[PDB]
């Protein structure tokens, strides 16, 4: 009889929680290509000429 509706209100309260989510990310660097160049005095000059 002492515990009333206007002597003990009863509130509900929660916090806003973001939904958990599981994702994959694979980072692969730019491809690396072998190059073979030869330089001789003539091949320089041939272009130069």
């Amino acid at each position: 009889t002492l515990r009333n509706k206007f002597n003990y209100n009863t509130r509900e309260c929660q916090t806003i929680n973001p939904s958990i989510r599981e994702r994959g990310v694979s980072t692969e660097p730019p491809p690396s290509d072998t190059i073979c160049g030869n330089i001789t005095q003539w091949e320089i000059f041939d272009a130069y000429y």
Binding site: P29, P30, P31, S32, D33, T34, I35, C36, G37, N38, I39, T40, Q41, I44, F45, A47, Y48, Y49
Partner: protein, 106 residues
């Protein structure tokens, strides 16, 4: 006169500040940056006699600060190489006469 008069010893003497590109795997805009730095770089530390070590001390440090940390650059009269490089990271341009400049980013 013209090409017939021009001999190798006259052609080299006539013109030192010429520029000639062989290969160019690197992008169009990034070449314009590097080409200006290496030409100005070598001529500075060409000194009385061309210190090939001195040239590639300057080019190494410049191209480390300018772009990326592990940039490798070699110059020479004549040589053969095979060099694994990343995509669009490599320029091969030789200077007039007997100077072959290979620059790349590993």
């Amino acid at each position: 006169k013209a090409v017939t008069d021009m001999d190798i010893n006259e052609l080299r003497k006539l013109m030192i500040g010429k520029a000639i590109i062989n290969s160019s795997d690197m992008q169009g805009d990034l070449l314009q940056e590097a080409q200006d730095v290496i030409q100005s770089g070598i001529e500075n530390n060409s000194a009385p006699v061309l210190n090939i070590e001195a040239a590639c001390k300057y080019i190494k440090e410049n191209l480390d600060k300018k772009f990326g940390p592990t940039w490798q650059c070699i110059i020479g009269e004549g040589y053969a190489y095979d060099v694994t490089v990343q995509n669009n990271t490599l320029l091969f341009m030789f200077y007039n006469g007997n100077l072959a400049v290979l620059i790349f980013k590993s």
